[PDB]
Design a protein around this ligand. Structure first.
Ligand SMILES: NC(=O)c1ccc[n+]([C@@H]2O[C@H](COP(=O)([O-])OP(=O)(O)OC[C@H]3O[C@@H](n4cnc5c(N)ncnc54)[C@H](O)[C@@H]3O)[C@@H](O)[C@H]2O)c1
Ligand SMILES: NC(=O)c1ccc[n+]([C@@H]2O[C@H](COP(=O)([O-])OP(=O)(O)OC[C@H]3O[C@@H](n4cnc5c(N)ncnc54)[C@H](O)[C@@H]3O)[C@@H](O)[C@H]2O)c1
Lengths: 315, 314
């Protein structure tokens, strides 16, 4: 049974523990955070947006007991000094935001852990995995991997169906991110690398996509729009049917008229919105728009934990 | 000869239109009509949440609102047929209630004695739709009811006209991010007629554009993105150069890194954002993104008054 440690028991780290508690063959043995256990427990159990933890959780000396099992709590800012080897930790879920490349994340391996999964893009010597699109690139010999970004997890399953079933010539992405000091009150255009980087996840789309982001100062569901030129003719109905045929626990399918609060709490990495699909045909030339939603916290966390569980099965 | 205007619906738009018309010569507002108590209307004329304080004096006399020392008659009748436009010699009504946005409803103003109506919104396809700076030349002065289009159409049209003229447009899809029932705390996808209306304002683009809106629950500047396929190759620099070449009081050009609060209060109908232009080239096939900003209230109102002045001089 695989032992995990969560480094950074923040928004993502806490939700990741909620999801790992649903699984067999894997358990969190320890968490590390700069915040005292007392407050971390309250934030883990009670959440205004993602609801109450569905399980038991209590505080002990230097530990939290979740569903009857002790989880050690540490507060050490330096990962090299954590007792991962002494505790037999197999995999560290790195969720602090401060160790998001290979050389920084390998501090966990110098501390005795065997593997690391970064909760963010990890650089170019680190495999990047969107569960449901490319987890089969993992064979278990990797030491550090990445579960990509929230935008990549939203875009990739949609782009993958378009590429597999129609062929993509090119496309431009616009992501509306529901969240420097400007961003609190303004719509703010922002660079993203997610579309440019999509070849890390879908090699066939390398060099075919670009895009950017509009950061909107409201906390709610986010969305990614893709405007593409395809290699074969398409109807709205045919595109929507292909997306539904691909739907899964990672890729949801929606045909309701929804608003952004309806997305909060989904466990899909991406929720394809079939009501927004449009195909413009002018003189035989076609231009296609497709839109998928994501819950920036929960969608990413559920993908992260799926990727972790799959990786954990390869060792 | 001076033109007399009446404003029907002294709401957000009707009030800002009076603000703008007070700044113009050769034209003046003779009357306003609205159902809201005049006391609440004076306060909102003097104090607007987004556009700030009115730059002048306004007080409530008997049966009138005195603005910069000049009385404007005030009425409250939900039925335009019964308004005294003929008695007052009203040349043009700005129809800004939101409820008379087609030809049959607007022509009540003509029956009441006004010579002409400009609807502050799309007014149906049997009413000429004008975006000033793009197609006001379709007006000959024999029209009785016209439309100054929507805020989104006024933002998109000058951008699309330059693309069509310098490169030719095969097709395009628009996304408008619209600052503002659920739209008060949610992002709400919404249908819009704007990209189709572009096929009226710019007939060569008929049938070639469509799009949609994402309503975002924030009072700030809005923007419109167009993703297009063009008939001729193009670069980011050439597209930006053409937008700057075409700039005017109606169509601004921006090169700085700006955010939506920087757009509040602009008097352009559209502000092209050169920093957001993207041309992607793959195997020789090009896909183009162009973005322009607008203030849903102030951009549109300034276009509405421009159209009103042009129409009234014909
Ligand atoms: N929408 C999201 O929040 C989101 C989505 C996808 C990915 N991510 C990524 O996940 C990571 C964390 O984001 P988050 O929203 O959970 O941030 P957060 O600020 O809620 O949590 C980060 C936690 O790390 C702790 N911490 C910081 N430095 C530490 C250190 N040296 N040692 C131990 N603990 C440390 C903090 O106390 C905090 O609890 C980042 O990489 C972020 O990009 C976030
Ligand atoms: N962003 C914007 O607010 C915006 C931008 C462009 C165009 N418009 C259009 O302009 C019109 C007005 O919008 P608004 O934002 O000013 O609306 P508003 O609700 O602020 O103003 C409408 C006014 O009309 C009055 N009114 C309603 N019915 C009336 C009637 N039968 N007789 C007389 N007065 C009546 C109301 O009392 C109110 O004062 C609409 O067609 C709208 O689509 C609005």
């Amino acid at each position: 049974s695989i032992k995990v440690a969560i480094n950074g028991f923040g928004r993502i780290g806490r939700l990741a523990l909620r999801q790992i508690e649903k699984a067999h063959g894997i358990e969190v043995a320890a968490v590390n955070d700069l915040t005292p256990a007392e407050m971390l427990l309250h934030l883990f159990k009670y959440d205004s947006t993602q609801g109450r933890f569905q399980g038991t959780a209590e505080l002990k000396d230097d530990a939290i007991v979740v569903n009857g099992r002790e989880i050690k709590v540490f507060a050490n800012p330096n990962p090299e000094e954590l007792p991962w080897g002494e505790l037999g930790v197999d995999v560290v879920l790195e969720c602090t935001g401060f160790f998001t490349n290979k050389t920084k994340a390998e501090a966990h391996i110098r501390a005795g852990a065997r593997k690391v999964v970064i909760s963010a893009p990890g650089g170019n010597d680190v495999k990047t995995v969107v569960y449901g699109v490319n987890q089969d690139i993992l064979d278990g010999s990797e030491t550090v991997i990445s579960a990509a970004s929230c935008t990549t997890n939203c875009l990739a399953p949609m782009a993958a169906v378009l590429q597999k079933e129609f062929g993509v010539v090119e496309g431009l992405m616009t992501t509306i991110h529901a969240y420097a000091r400007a961003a609190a009150l303004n719509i703010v255009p922002n660079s993203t690398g997610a579309a440019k980087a999509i070849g890390l996840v879908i090699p066939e789309l390398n060099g075919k996509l670009d895009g950017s982001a509009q950061r909107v100062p409201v906390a709610t569901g986010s969305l990614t729009e893709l405007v593409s030129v395809l290699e074969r003719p398409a109807t709205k109905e045919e595109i929507n049917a292909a997306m539904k045929a691909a739907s899964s626990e990672s890729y949801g399918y929606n045909e309701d008229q929804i608003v952004s609060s309806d997305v909060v709490g989904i466990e899909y990495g991406s929720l394809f919105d079939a009501t927004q699909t449009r195909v413009m045909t002018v003189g035989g030339k076609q231009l296609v728009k497709t839109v998928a939603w994501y819950d920036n916290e929960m969608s990413y966390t559920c993908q992260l934990v799926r990727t972790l569980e799959y990786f954990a099965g390869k060792i």
